[PDB]
Amino acid sequence: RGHKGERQRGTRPRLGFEGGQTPFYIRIPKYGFNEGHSFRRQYKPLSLNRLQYLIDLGRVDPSQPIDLTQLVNGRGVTIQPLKRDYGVQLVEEGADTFTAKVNIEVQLASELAIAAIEKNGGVVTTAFYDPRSLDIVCKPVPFFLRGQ
Amino acid sequence: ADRMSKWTSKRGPRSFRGRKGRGAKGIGFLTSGWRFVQIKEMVPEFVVPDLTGFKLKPYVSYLAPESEETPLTAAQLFSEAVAPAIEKDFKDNLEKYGFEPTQEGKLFQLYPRNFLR
Amino acid sequence: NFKRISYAKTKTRAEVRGGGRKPWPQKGTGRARHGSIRSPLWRGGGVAHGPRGPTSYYYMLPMKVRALGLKVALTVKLAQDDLHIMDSLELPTGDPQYLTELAHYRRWGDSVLLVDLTHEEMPQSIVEATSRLKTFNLIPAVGLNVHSMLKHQTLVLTLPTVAFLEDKLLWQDSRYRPLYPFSLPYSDFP
Amino acid sequence: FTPPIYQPKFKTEKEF
Amino acid sequence: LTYFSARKGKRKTVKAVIDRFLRLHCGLWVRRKAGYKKKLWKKTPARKKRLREFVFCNKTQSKLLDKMTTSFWKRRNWYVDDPYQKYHDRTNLKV
Amino acid sequence: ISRKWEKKNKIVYPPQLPGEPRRPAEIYHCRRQIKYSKDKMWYLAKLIRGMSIDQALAQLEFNDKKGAKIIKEVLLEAQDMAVRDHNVEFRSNLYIAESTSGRGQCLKRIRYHGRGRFGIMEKVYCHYFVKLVEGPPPPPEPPKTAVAHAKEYIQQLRSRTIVHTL
Amino acid sequence: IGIRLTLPPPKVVDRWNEKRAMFGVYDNIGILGNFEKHPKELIRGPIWLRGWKGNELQRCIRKRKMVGSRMFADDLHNLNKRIRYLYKHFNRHGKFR
Amino acid sequence: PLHKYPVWLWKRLQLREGICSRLPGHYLRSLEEERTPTPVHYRPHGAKFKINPKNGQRERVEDVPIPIYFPPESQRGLWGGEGWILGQIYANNDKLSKRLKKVWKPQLFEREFYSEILDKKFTVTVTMRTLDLIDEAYGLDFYILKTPKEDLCSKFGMDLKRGMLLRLARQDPQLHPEDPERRAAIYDKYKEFAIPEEEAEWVGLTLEEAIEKQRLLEEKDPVPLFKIYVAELIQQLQQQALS
RNA sequence: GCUAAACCUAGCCCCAAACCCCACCUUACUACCAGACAACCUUAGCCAAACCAUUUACCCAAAUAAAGUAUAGGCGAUAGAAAUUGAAAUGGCGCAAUAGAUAUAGUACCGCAAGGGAAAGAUGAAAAACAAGCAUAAUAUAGCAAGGACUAACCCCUAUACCUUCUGCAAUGAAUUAACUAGAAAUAACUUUGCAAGGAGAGCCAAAGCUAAGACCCCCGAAACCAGACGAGCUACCUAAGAACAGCUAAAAGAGCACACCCGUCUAUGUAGCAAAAUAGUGGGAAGAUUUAUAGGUAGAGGCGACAAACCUACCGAGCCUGGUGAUAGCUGGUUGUCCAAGAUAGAAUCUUAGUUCAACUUUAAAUUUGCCCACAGAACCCAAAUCCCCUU
RNA sequence: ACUGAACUCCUCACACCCAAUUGGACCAAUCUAUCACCCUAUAGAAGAACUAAUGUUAGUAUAAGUAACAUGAAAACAUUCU
RNA sequence: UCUCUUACUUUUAACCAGUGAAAUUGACCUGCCCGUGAGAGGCGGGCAUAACACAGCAAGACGAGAGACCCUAUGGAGCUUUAAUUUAUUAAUGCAAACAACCUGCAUUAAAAAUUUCGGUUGGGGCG
Ligand SMILES: Nc1nc2c(ncn2[C@@H]2O[C@H](COP(=O)(O)OP(=O)(O)OP(=O)(O)O)[C@@H](O)[C@H]2O)c(=O)[nH]1
Ligand SMILES: [Mg+2]
Ligand SMILES: [Mg+2]
Ligand SMILES: [Mg+2]
Ligand SMILES: [Mg+2]
Ligand SMILES: [Mg+2]
Ligand SMILES: [Mg+2]
Ligand SMILES: [Mg+2]
Ligand SMILES: [Mg+2]
Ligand SMILES: [Mg+2]
Ligand SMILES: [Mg+2]
Ligand SMILES: [Mg+2]
Ligand SMILES: [Mg+2]
Ligand SMILES: [Mg+2]
Ligand SMILES: [Mg+2]
Ligand SMILES: [Mg+2]
Ligand SMILES: [Mg+2]
Ligand SMILES: [Mg+2]
Ligand SMILES: [Mg+2]
Ligand SMILES: [Mg+2]
Ligand SMILES: [Mg+2]
Ligand SMILES: [Mg+2]
Ligand SMILES: [Mg+2]
Ligand SMILES: [Mg+2]
Ligand SMILES: [Mg+2]
Ligand SMILES: [Mg+2]
Ligand SMILES: [Mg+2]
Ligand SMILES: [Mg+2]
Ligand SMILES: [Mg+2]
Ligand SMILES: [Mg+2]
Structure with a gap:
């Protein structure tokens, strides 16, 4: 603990205290960096690379419509509605090597991702899900056990 | 200063010692x-x-x-004191058999007991 | 450790009876300064850093780690020649002497852990034989554990128990990351 | 002024 | 700060930090320059341009802010049109 | 507490061979819990150390200290038991081989002082121990003679070695 | 003199009493029983620390939360004081900050 | 150790044990049930959800009632759910100023009220809120019979309620005797509030008063065992004779 | 060989389960007379904010999660939800007489009272069987008491006790023995596993992550503040009803001298005392505003006061006890096994200079490649010493 | 010239002399698991180590057998005397 | 009282007998001169030096147990204020309320108080 002093006694000031000089984190002005952060909508990215990888490994079946439930079941994406996740957004990454004909339903979709999906002969639709519906979609079995 | 010793009539001043007694009935x-x-x-x-x-x-x-040992009971006393006469008169107003409605008017009332021992 | 709950507890200087008033003034008495007769320094005082309340030692290794430990225990027994497979646990008689003599003749260890598929179907003969034995312990398949496997010198398994253990442990391999507790319904999980 | 402190009386009354 | 709250036993977040600093998931902390809204009439254009900029924090400052904020603020956030999405990660960084 | 002194009288030696010197008798006696300071008793014990029983009794009979009477009683009892039980032929043929005083079990009392302060008196008790050995008292150690001193010095001189060398 | 002058009575431990012999059985109840029961459900002890762990402050908070209403008067007073003291200690004292 | 039950359930357990158990079921239910009194000293929120201006998001809102202190003098009067507000204020209404204890008391008036059912005039210390409530109820009798226990919040008010309810239940001829038509008119006017007398007897009784009433009801001097044994012996002899 | 030393169970701790004759409110423990008074009412403060003044977590009616999120806040210290989700159900890696309950006991003892509050016992199947301190044994020129030694105890030579606080010794603490007596934890990081673009037994994290484990955060001490009790058997004053005041001189006296009585001017004794304010002498008053016994009253953000800030149960510029309370203390003191290793003075801000934060220095682990020394050449006019830079080596 | 260190050489062996701090290797005793069985091993734990707080309790020292204390005289122990 | 002290008696005292504390105490096998140190029994150079008792003394052991002075603390408390913040409380008025008064609410003015503080440098003090 060192020699006698406030720290050795174990009563040093709180974290961020600077001995009386105005603390750094209080002398920096307030700015709305995180204003409304808990209300901003979040969409988990689902790159075409990831989608093609899932289809290739058979964790997602392109012979049937692909929606958030199928993605979650195949573990292609993790959705956290409690953390303001509003669904999945298609991402153009991997577009040049996407060669799957799929019927995928997402929440957001980039122009290039839509172009790749449609060029491969598939169909893509952007569908909205409120937080409650999104939670039910992502984890249907617990909802069924809720008995509602 | 003595809190534990029993409070008797030997302790206080003259008035206390005269006023307190030893349990003798008045x-x-x-x-x-x-x-x-x-x-x-x-x-x-x-x-x-x-x-x-x-x-x-x-x-x-x-x-x-x-x-x-057979401790006496109300039922036993009734059987040994009232049942004979009751049976005889029934074969052949409960006061006649010994019942007393109110203890009032008696020298020796059973409740509230008004006699010694 | 995970089941452990140490019930040891001691009274701190706040909880020791009395000790409110200052024993003597700060200065004048020529004695050491004190604030109560129940500080850790005093006889009968509190304990400065003693055990506090019932303490849990609960923690969970990953279920994959625990299944791997079970697999490793089984492999260790097999490689060290302490694992014996049985067609069934049926015994000619429920006499514990028969079981002890059989183990001694076959050169099993002083301690044997017999395992059967389910509790309900375990033969009455073996049940009676092992109920009266201390070093011969009979458990259902669901009760198999590394601790008992290591405590008992030899491990005896039935063929259905072998199949059950293989299925259950191999399932941990090649399983998805859970979406929710496996107690809940799954497409292919009984 | 600091008053004198008497020790407990039992400590000086024990007998064989 | 409060290392163990009295109701949950959790570590609390100093909201004065949240109201002032942005954390990039890479670990950098961004801030405004103090006095960027003060007495601009007596500040030269270069000084005003310097003050109007978003600025990174020191290593020790970033460590202090990380200590003062909890893990919830140090997660991945996939906001829709975040202006800092590109800045949330580092590229071509050697040691 | 320890009571080994009393037990010391119960040791039985094996019979002596005819061609062996007659073992002098030894009698251990003591008095416990004497209301007297062991420091004060030590002087009487030291005084009577090494003296014959009769000489010790004579010296104690004319000593003003309270402990003298107690020591005289103890010595008389020791003499009586030596004659009766330890097969000592003559009463007077005994000398005090050992005599010591030991601390007894003491009691603590309060001594009131002037200003509400106090001290802790100790009601001091002491033990007294004696060993009586049969036979005439051993002669006192003669004082060192000049001849003996010179002999010792010359022995020390002759004992010299060439130190720290081959 | 703080040492005993005689050997203490021999301590005989039955390593094969039922408790030791069956110790640990059903620890794998979850992974070997289709996860019907969690292993922590095998824990027997105070209601407020079954399948849970924390430092002294967290333990005291949980105890007050879960059985505080059922606690005796002076025990509850001591628990409240302990929570207060532990809050002050953990949130205001220590080498690191 | 730990109590088997939470300390806050001890009153309910005591109610389920003893003479309180023997108390009539309807009275026990009335005691057990608790309803929030009508807001008096605070303005309730209109809806359960509100769009908070700060972040413009929908948030749940709750109506947390202001604690009210009712001095015993109130129990002798009819305060329309009004009482003393024992709270605190910020000097000059700014939180950066001193905090001062503040007691807001209601303005009490002495007024005379006539009860049609009771055919009596009562002088009652009353509040303007109580007068307004009486006007809204169209009379003291209607106000007393309508206002529940929590809103009435007056032992005298509950006693008046019990008296009126008992009068209605019994159809007592003591109401305007020699004027049966007027009595019937009053009873018809207040018909809707009539309830069985067995229930009206227990309206507005405190727990202690109900316990005392039950004790008085069920107190009986023990029957002498002479009578019981005579009856038993006579019955036995009847059976012996018949068989 | 004395004092002593030794013991194992009396019991206790944490959980689970389970809900639990007579007398006595008057002076309590008092056989036996005209009632009437009856209860409810925000806690505060310490403390944190390094002052403090708004503010500062606290039996709440399901664990977990949402979440330390929304929000609140000298927008600062800090405080902090809800919607929503919905788990389960037999003792001890506790103490063993300075421990564990204070407990052999709320007893003894202490206090007027509220309150405070101990200590200790050890045979046997049967009782109808080795600490300190001393002694044995006082002591020999000279010296931190030992070491090198030596034939030899000493003699010879060498040697400035320990801890802590300072730049350094002086200063602090220690009679000594036994027992007891003081580092509690998150953020991340590091190591070791598991699995791996996924990890985790819901929630959470994830651009190699994730899960789990290991591993870091002391003790004693104020004057204080506030809440509620208890105190006017001392003392201050007062109320009721009492009592005392010899003798002489004067005469109806807040008169004089002087007993008892009250007080306490000066000296001496005493100073752990006879005494926690006394004794002897000397002295002031001693029919008055006197002294005094009895009962009652005034109670602490108060009482009472011929103000001395006096007295209010020996310690009153704000009593005592209990509680908040383990108050707080940037101050003092302490902070216990062995061994090795690296390891020293640059400033800045600060109600700040007895402190802290940053820097600098120091330590550990890791990545990479240049680091130091330094040849020329080079670094200002106004008008010494050296320093920086720097290829080689 | 010689004497003269823990400098240097010599035979052998080497981690074995810095405050605060920091890294590391071991470890007494206790309990638990399993060993062991005249007192141990591998691990898991923790009220886990005292030459020092005018530290707490108990014992005994030092001062010290010191300061201090006490019982008028004779006697027939009737009594008398001061 | 003193020049100027003396004699005696009692207590005390010292010896014998009984009983038997307290402060204090790191260990002490505990010397003097000079020097060093800013102050020496313990360090350096010299000198002295068998061992212990008993009674005195008060030069040293910065003698022991309790004392004052200066400075510090973002430590208290008492007191005063034209220090800051308040009027919670009382007393007045005014306006509402209600039928002049009382009560309640809101204001204003006083009295009484309540909480808290009293920065830094400049030997102190005054003015600076
Ligand atoms: N954890 C715990 N278990 C206890 C406690 N007291 C008793 N038990 C358990 O109660 C069970 C039954 O106790 P027993 O005395 O054998 O039988 P019992 O008298 O029928 O038991 P109860 O009905 O509980 O009184 C056993 O498993 C005990 O270990 C206790 O204080 N704590
Ligand atoms: Mg320091
Ligand atoms: Mg306490
Ligand atoms: Mg204790
Ligand atoms: Mg006294
Ligand atoms: Mg503060
Ligand atoms: Mg005890
Ligand atoms: Mg010894
Ligand atoms: Mg000392
Ligand atoms: Mg009085
Ligand atoms: Mg006169
Ligand atoms: Mg006069
Ligand atoms: Mg004055
Ligand atoms: Mg004055
Ligand atoms: Mg006092
Ligand atoms: Mg403290
Ligand atoms: Mg080194
Ligand atoms: Mg400042
Ligand atoms: Mg400071
Ligand atoms: Mg040499
Ligand atoms: Mg310890
Ligand atoms: Mg020790
Ligand atoms: Mg000590
Ligand atoms: Mg002595
Ligand atoms: Mg002396
Ligand atoms: Mg004397
Ligand atoms: Mg003497
Ligand atoms: Mg000198
Ligand atoms: Mg002398
Ligand atoms: Mg000295």
Whole structure:
């Protein structure tokens, strides 16, 4: 603990205290960096690379419509509605090597991702899900056990 | 300063020592001049019986046979004192058989008990 | 450790009876300064850093780690020649002497852990034989554990128990990351 | 002024 | 700060930090320059341009802010049109 | 507490061979819990150390200290038991081989002082121990003679070695 | 003199009493029983620390939360004081900050 | 150790044990049930959800009632759910100023009220809120019979309620005797509030008063065992004779 | 060989389960007379904010999660939800007489009271069987008491006790023995596993992550503040009803001298005392505003006061006890096994200079490649010493 | 010239002399698992180590057998005397 | 009282007998001169030096147990204020309320108080 002093006694000031000089984190002005952060909508990215990888490994079946439930079941994406996740957004990454004909339903979709999906002969639709519906979609079995 | 010793009439000043007693039951009252009037009826009169010719003794011979204790009960007393007459009169107003509705009017009331011992 | 709940507890200087008033003034008495007769320094005082309340030692290794431990225990027994497979646990008689003599003749260890598929179907003969034995312990398949496997010198398994253990442990391999507790319904999980 | 402190009386009353 | 709250036993976040600093998931902390809204009439254009900029924090400052904020603020946030999405990660960084 | 002194009288030696010197008798006696300071008793014990029983009794009979009477009683009891039980032929043929005083079990009392302060008196008790050995008292150690001193010095001189060398 | 002058009575431990012999059985109840029961459900002890762990402050908070209403008067007072003291200690004292 | 039950359930357990158990079921239910009194000293929120201006998001809102202190003098009067507000204020209404204890008391008036059912005039210390409530109820009798226990919040008010309810239940001819038509008119006017007398007897009784009433009801001097044994012996003899 | 030393169970701790004759409110423990008074009412403060003044977590009616999120806040210290989700159900890696309950006991003892509050016992199947301190044994020129030694105890030579606080010794603490007596934890990081673009037994994290484990955060001490009790048997004053005041001089006296009585001017004794304010002498008053016994009253953000800030149960510029309370203390003191290793003075801000934060220095682990020394050449006019830079080596 | 260190050489062996701090290797005793069975091993734990707080309790020292204390005289122990 | 002290008696005292504390105490096998140190029994150079008792003394052991002075603390408390913040409380008025008064609410003015503080440098003090 060192020699006698406030720290050795174990009563040093709180974290961020600077001995009386105005603390750094209080002398920096307030700015709305995180204003409304808990209300901003979040969409988990689902790159075409990831989608093609899932289809290739058979964790997602392109012979049937692909929606958030199928993605979650195949573990292609993790959705956290409690953390303001509003669904999945298609991402153009991997577009040049996407060669799957799929019927995928997402929440957001980039122009290039839509172009790749449609060029491969598939169909893509952007569908909205409120937080409650999104939670039910992502984890249907617990909802069924809720008995509602 | 002594909290544990019992509080008796030997402890306080003159007034305390005179006022407190030793549990002896009162015999009368005090009139003017501190003259004590003793009421005869307040004095317990010992109803001592005539023991002449009595056969019992403080002790019982060990030769007496052993018996089983049977504490008397209200039902047993009723059976041994009331049931005979009740049965006889029924075969042939409960006051006639011994029942007394109100203890009031008796010298020896059973409740609230108004006699000694 | 995970089941452990140490019930040891001691009274701190706040909980020791009395000790409110200052024993003597700060200065004048020529004695050491004190604030109560129940500080840790005093006889009968509190304990400065003693055990506090019932303490849990609960923690969970990953279920994959625990299944791997079970697999490793089984492999260790097999490689060290302490694992014996049985067609069934049926015994000619429920006499514990028969079981002890059989173990001694076959050169099993002083301690044997017999395992059967389920509790309900375990033969009455073996049940009676092992109920009266201390070093011969009979458990259902669901009760198999590394601790008992290591405590008992030899491990005896039935063929259904072998199949059950293989299925259950191999399932941990090649399973998805859970979406929710496996107690809940799954497409292919009984 | 600091008053004198008497020790407990039992400590000086024990007998064989 | 409060290392163990009295109701949950959790570590609390100093909201004065949240109201002032942005954390990039890479670990950098961004801030405004103090006095960027003060007495601009007596500040030269270069000084005003310097003050109007978003600025990174020191290593020790970033460590202090990380200590003062909890893990919830140090997660991945996939906001829709975040202006700092590109800045949330580092590229071509050697040691 | 320890009571080994009393037990010391119960040791039985094996019979002596005819061609062996007669073992002098030894009698251990003591008095416990004497209301007297062991420091004060030590002086009487030291005084009577090494003296014959009769000489010790004579010296104690004319000593003003309270402990003298107690020691005299103890010595008389020791003499009586030596004659009766330890097969000592002559009463007077005994000398005090050992005599010591030991601390007894003491009691603590309070001594009131002037200003509400106090001290801790100790009601001091002491033990007294004696060993009586049969036979005339051993002669006192003669004082060192000049001849003996010179002999010792010359022995020390002869004992010299060439130190720290081959 | 703080040492005993005689050997203490021999301590005989039955390593094969039922408790030791069956110790640990059903620890794998979850992974070997289709996860019907969690292993922590095998824990027997205070209601407020079954399948849970924390430092002294967290333990005291949980105890007050879960059985505080059922606690005796002076025990609850001591628990409240302990929570207060532990809050002050953990949130205001220590080498690191 | 730990109590088997939470300390806050001890009153309910005591109610389920003893003479309180023997108390009539309807009275026990009335005691057990608790309803929030009508807001008096605070303005309730209109809806359960509100769009908070700060972040413009929908948030749940709750109506947390202001604690009210009712001095015993209130129990002798009819305060329309009004009482003393024992709270605190910020000097000059700014939180950066001193905090001061503040007691807001209601303005009490002495007024005379006539009860049609009771055919009596009562002088009652009353509040303007109580007068307004009486006007809204169209009379003291209607106000007393309508206002529940929590809103009435007056032992005298509950006693008046019990008296009126008992009068209605019994159809007592003591109401305007020699004027049966007027009595019937009053009873018809207040018909809707009539309830069985067995229930009206227990309206507005405190727990202690109900316990005392039950004790008085169920107190009986023990029957002498002479009567019981005579009846038993006579019955036994009847059976013996018949068989 | 004395004092002593030794013991194992009396019991206790944490959980689970389970809901639990007579007398006595008057002076309590008092057989026996005309009632009437009856209860409810925000806690505060310490403390944190390094002052403090708004503010500062606290039996709440399901654990977990949402979440330390929304929000609140000298927008600062800090405080902090809800919607929503919905788990389960037999003792001890506790103490063993300075421990564990204070407990052999709320007893003894202490206090007027509220309150405070101990200590200790050890045979046997049967009782109808080795600490300190001393002694044995006082001591020999000279010296931190030992070491090198030596034939030899000493003699010879060498040697400035320990801890802590300072730049350094002086200063602090220690009679000594036994027992007891003081580092509690998150953020991340590091190591070791598991699995791996996925990890985790819901929630959470994830651009190699994730899960789990290991591993870091002391003790004693104020004057204080506030809440509620208890105190006017001392003392201050007062109320009721009492009592005392010899003798002489004067005469109806807040008169004089002087007993008892009250007080306490000066000296001496005493100073752990006879005494926690006394004794002897000397002295002031001693029929008055006197002294005094009895009962009652005034109670602490108060009482009472011929103001001395005096007295209010020996310690009153704000009593005592209990509680908040383990108050707080940037201050003092302490902070216990062995061994090795690296390891020293640059400033800045600060109600700040007895402190802290940053820097600098120091330590550990890791990545990479240049680091130091330094040849020329080079670094200002106004008008010494050296320093920086720097290829080689 | 010689004497003269823990400098240097010599035979052998080497981690074995810095405050605060920091890294590391071991470890007494206790309990638990399993060993062991005249007192141990591998691990898991923790009220886990005292030459020092005018530290707490108990014992005994030092001062010290010191300061201090006490019982008028004779006697027939009747009594008398001061 | 003193020049100028003396004699005696009692207590005390010292010896014998009984009983038997307290402060204090790191260990002490505990010397003097000079020097060093800013102050020496313990360090350096010299000198002295068998061992212990008993009674005195008060030069040293910065003698022991309790004392004052200066400075510090973002430590208290008492007191005063034209220090800051308040009027919670009382007393007044005014306006509402209600039928002049009382009560309640809101204001204003006083009295009484309540909480808290009293920065830094400049030997102190005054003015600076
Ligand atoms: N954890 C715990 N278990 C206890 C406690 N007291 C008793 N038990 C358990 O109670 C069970 C039954 O106790 P027993 O005394 O054998 O039987 P019992 O008298 O029928 O038991 P109860 O009905 O509980 O009184 C056993 O498993 C005990 O270990 C206790 O204080 N704590
Ligand atoms: Mg420091
Ligand atoms: Mg306490
Ligand atoms: Mg204890
Ligand atoms: Mg006294
Ligand atoms: Mg503060
Ligand atoms: Mg005890
Ligand atoms: Mg010894
Ligand atoms: Mg000392
Ligand atoms: Mg008085
Ligand atoms: Mg006169
Ligand atoms: Mg006069
Ligand atoms: Mg004055
Ligand atoms: Mg003055
Ligand atoms: Mg006092
Ligand atoms: Mg402290
Ligand atoms: Mg080194
Ligand atoms: Mg400042
Ligand atoms: Mg400071
Ligand atoms: Mg040399
Ligand atoms: Mg310890
Ligand atoms: Mg020790
Ligand atoms: Mg000590
Ligand atoms: Mg002595
Ligand atoms: Mg002396
Ligand atoms: Mg003397
Ligand atoms: Mg003497
Ligand atoms: Mg000198
Ligand atoms: Mg002398
Ligand atoms: Mg000295």
